Scaffold this active site. Sequence first.
Site, PDB file in Angstrom:
ATOM      1  N   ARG A  52      88.932  26.213 -56.716  1.00 28.85           N
ATOM      2  CA  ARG A  52      90.120  25.346 -56.870  1.00 28.85           C
ATOM      3  C   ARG A  52      91.241  25.686 -55.875  1.00 28.85           C
ATOM      4  NH1 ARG A  52      90.056  28.832 -60.837  1.00 28.85           N
ATOM      5  NH2 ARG A  52      91.816  30.273 -61.140  1.00 28.85           N
ATOM      6  N   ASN A  53      91.305  26.955 -55.457  1.00 30.67           N
ATOM      7  CA  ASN A  53      92.290  27.441 -54.476  1.00 30.67           C
ATOM      8  C   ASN A  53      91.726  27.678 -53.055  1.00 30.67           C
ATOM      9  OD1 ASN A  53      94.254  27.435 -56.564  1.00 30.67           O
ATOM     10  ND2 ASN A  53      93.609  29.489 -57.222  1.00 30.67           N
TER      11      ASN A  53
ATOM     12  N   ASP B 111      93.948  35.480 -57.229  1.00 29.69           N
ATOM     13  CA  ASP B 111      93.556  34.188 -57.830  1.00 29.69           C
ATOM     14  C   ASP B 111      92.608  33.417 -56.903  1.00 29.69           C
ATOM     15  OD1 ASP B 111      93.311  31.938 -59.512  1.00 29.69           O
ATOM     16  OD2 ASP B 111      95.418  31.358 -59.403  1.00 29.69           O
TER      17      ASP B 111
ATOM     18  N   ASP C 260      97.106  29.018 -52.524  1.00 28.49           N
ATOM     19  CA  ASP C 260      97.717  29.502 -53.770  1.00 28.49           C
ATOM     20  C   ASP C 260      98.064  30.996 -53.694  1.00 28.49           C
ATOM     21  OD1 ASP C 260      98.583  29.783 -56.574  1.00 28.49           O
ATOM     22  OD2 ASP C 260      97.518  27.900 -56.933  1.00 28.49           O
TER      23      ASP C 260
HETATM   24  C1  LIG Z   1      94.970  19.523 -56.407  1.00 27.09           C
HETATM   25  C2  LIG Z   1      94.671  19.444 -54.907  1.00 27.09           C
HETATM   26  C3  LIG Z   1      94.755  20.870 -54.359  1.00 27.09           C
HETATM   27  O1  LIG Z   1      93.337  18.948 -54.734  1.00 27.09           O
HETATM   28  C4  LIG Z   1      95.710  18.526 -54.234  1.00 27.09           C
HETATM   29  N1  LIG Z   1      95.297  17.959 -52.931  1.00 27.09           N
HETATM   30  C5  LIG Z   1      95.611  18.433 -51.681  1.00 27.09           C
HETATM   31  N2  LIG Z   1      96.301  19.611 -51.441  1.00 27.09           N
HETATM   32  C6  LIG Z   1      96.986  19.967 -50.316  1.00 27.09           C
HETATM   33  O2  LIG Z   1      97.060  19.223 -49.353  1.00 27.09           O
HETATM   34  C7  LIG Z   1      97.585  21.334 -50.255  1.00 27.09           C
HETATM   35  C8  LIG Z   1      97.802  21.941 -49.005  1.00 27.09           C
HETATM   36  C9  LIG Z   1      98.317  23.229 -48.926  1.00 27.09           C
HETATM   37  F1  LIG Z   1      98.534  23.782 -47.709  1.00 27.09           F
HETATM   38  C10 LIG Z   1      98.606  23.949 -50.088  1.00 27.09           C
HETATM   39  C11 LIG Z   1      98.387  23.378 -51.350  1.00 27.09           C
HETATM   40  C12 LIG Z   1      98.667  24.135 -52.610  1.00 27.09           C
HETATM   41  C13 LIG Z   1      97.761  24.068 -53.696  1.00 27.09           C
HETATM   42  C14 LIG Z   1      98.033  24.786 -54.855  1.00 27.09           C
HETATM   43  C15 LIG Z   1      99.182  25.564 -54.913  1.00 27.09           C
HETATM   44  N3  LIG Z   1     100.013  25.623 -53.880  1.00 27.09           N
HETATM   45  C16 LIG Z   1      99.796  24.953 -52.755  1.00 27.09           C
HETATM   46  C17 LIG Z   1      97.869  22.080 -51.419  1.00 27.09           C
HETATM   47  N4  LIG Z   1      95.072  17.673 -50.763  1.00 27.09           N
HETATM   48  C18 LIG Z   1      94.420  16.640 -51.344  1.00 27.09           C
HETATM   49  C19 LIG Z   1      93.702  15.551 -50.828  1.00 27.09           C
HETATM   50  C20 LIG Z   1      93.121  14.634 -51.687  1.00 27.09           C
HETATM   51  C21 LIG Z   1      93.251  14.791 -53.067  1.00 27.09           C
HETATM   52  C22 LIG Z   1      93.965  15.862 -53.592  1.00 27.09           C
HETATM   53  C23 LIG Z   1      94.551  16.800 -52.740  1.00 27.09           C
END
Ligand SMILES: CC(C)(O)Cn1c(NC(=O)c2cc(F)cc(-c3cccnc3)c2)nc2ccccc21
Length: 291
Positions: A142-143, A138, A156
């Site tokens: 996005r990942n 995958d 992911d």
């Molecule tokens: C939707 C997404 C990814 O933008 C959320 N997001 C994240 N994501 C993470 O910090 C993060 C870190 C990881 F080590 C693994 C996953 C992870 C992601 C999918 C599945 N499993 C595990 C996500 N940081 C952000 C900062 C600002 C706005 C949104 C943010």
Amino acid sequence: EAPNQALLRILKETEFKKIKVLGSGAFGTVYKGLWIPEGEKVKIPVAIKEATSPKANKEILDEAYVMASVDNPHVCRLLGICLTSTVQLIMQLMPFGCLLDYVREHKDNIGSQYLLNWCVQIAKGMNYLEDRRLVHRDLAARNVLVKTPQHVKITDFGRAKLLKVPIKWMALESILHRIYTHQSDVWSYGVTVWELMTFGSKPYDGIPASEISSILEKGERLPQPPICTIDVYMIMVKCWMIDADSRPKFRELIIEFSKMARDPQRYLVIQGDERMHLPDDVVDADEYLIP
Ligand SMILES: CC(C)(O)Cn1c(NC(=O)c2cc(F)cc(-c3cccnc3)c2)nc2ccccc21
């Protein structure tokens, strides 16, 4: 196979503090948060990922298994898991979010230096999974998450395996016959690159996924992004070969992209390049790797 001596650390709910929600809905509920190990003057920024069913808990732990088993600069670190009613994966915080959102939000500020650097880092990250005998299954923008604009990592591993689905990133052999190798991830690497070089366009936009299998059989591929030279686009097309063994390995992609990253304005043509900031066929040894 070799024995997996990875430590899975179990963290107390008291040790960390949720601050705000980053992501939500289907894949989980991702929270911004701070973690403070019991007996250490250290605050580590983190992303916490949480209804409780038996099936849901299997899959979230299988992700945790793999994430705990990986240590690379361009692959996401699991810090621990907390065994509350709903299980929580404590992971390293990635402040700038996913790269797909990052490129779209900063279309007019991303130079060729950054694009090709992300190509190397992703390719590096995937090559580590190839070394660890893991197929990702995958790979997409996005990942891939953005620690800094100069540092990205793959994520992911809910779909990851040893040796709803995203048809538009999958190789033909995967779409037809459910066969996934490391070279099927190279196909997805190609698309991921194309996403970045199009500044986050949707691949095969306005085409339903059932048509894709037959489209790729007929020979059609994603078009050449405007900024891409023939040199860079050639590398994408090589990832999208019908014969899988004909595609490049990640070790070779690391080489070619690092080669290009030395002279980025030769291999990518962006409007007003290298006047923009964010917050001899030679390859340096560290980008030359044997399996
Ligand atoms: C939707 C997404 C990814 O933008 C959320 N997001 C994240 N994501 C993470 O910090 C993060 C870190 C990881 F080590 C693994 C996953 C992870 C992601 C999918 C599945 N499993 C595990 C996500 N940081 C952000 C900062 C600002 C706005 C949104 C943010």
